[PDB]
Amino acid sequence: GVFNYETETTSVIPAARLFKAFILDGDTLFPQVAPQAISSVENISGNGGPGTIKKISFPEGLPFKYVKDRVDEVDHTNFKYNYSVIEGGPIGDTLEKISNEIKIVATGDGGSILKISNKYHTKGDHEVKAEQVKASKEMGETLLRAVESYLLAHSDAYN
Amino acid sequence: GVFNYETETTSVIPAARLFKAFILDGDTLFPQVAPQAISSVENISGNGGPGTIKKISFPEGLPFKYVKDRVDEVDHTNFKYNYSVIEGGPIGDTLEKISNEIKIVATGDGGSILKISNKYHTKGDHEVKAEQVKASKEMGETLLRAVESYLLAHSDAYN
């Protein structure tokens, strides 16, 4: 089956600035600002656009050693980002892949909102556990806060 | 005028592996493996392909604060990389831009060779100083050695 789980998170960083840092430059920033979550990001193929395959490694202590993500679309105009988790991590036995979409929207107060959607493709009627969905949202939050903290500490970065 | 200066450097790393690390993932590796040369790399526009503009900052002590590079072409097939230096650094007064081409070629012994070409666009008959050309080649060498050292120390990276 196909199961979709959506969530929203708030950020104090304006959309344009956040998209550049959190989405476009996540590969270089994550391992620096969130060493407890991401140990390293390695390009496996492509130069950054659609079809690009990346390998994300996690510091030892996390449930997974690594995951391979594929960039599906990067829409600079609408601050939209689509990518899929296709190997490693929770991929296996009854879960074939996870398609994700991140959309960053500007808010009236000058900040932004991140609309997140995770779609799980499972075998037949098998469902995904709530913890797997929760863990996913928490890592997302954890990464955003790290990037957010870095930007507030370096006003000359990404602007 | 237009002045072209070419050079070649040898590497013990096979071409495919070196292209992924040194060219595709230079943005994430340089600030880590060569902190004395590059302090940080920031995406300014684009997702990595042609037209992408990046801002490279140098640790304080170097002659320049930063330079903006534009990706002109990324040829994954022929391991070719073209980019231009368009702002900051030596850009100014009589130098409009520097177009560079890097081509990585495999050698018989399993290593590789990097064919480097730097083309300077200057005003009228003004020439560039030899030091500027020398400094450019040395930084290139410095970066390559750092990446090379990192790969030999992490056999599971980029493969």
Swiss-Prot record, chains A, B:
Chain residues that bind brassinolide: K54, Y81, Y83, N100
PROSITE patterns in UniProt: PATHOGENESIS_BETVI (PS00451)
Keywords: Allergen, Cytoplasm, Pathogenesis-related protein, Plant defense
Gene Ontology molecular function: any one: protein phosphatase inhibitor activity
Gene Ontology CC, one term: cytoplasm
Pfam families xrefs: Bet_v_1
Statement: the UniProt record of this protein carries the keyword Cytoplasm: yes
GO process terms (BP): abscisic acid-activated signaling pathway; defense response
Localization annotation: Cytoplasm
Effect after changing N47S: Slightly reduced interaction with BV16
Entry similarity comment: Belongs to the BetVI family.
Function recorded in the entry: May be a general steroid carrier protein.
UniProt protein name: Major pollen allergen Bet v 1-A
Organism this protein belongs to: Betula pendula
Encoding gene (name): BETVIA
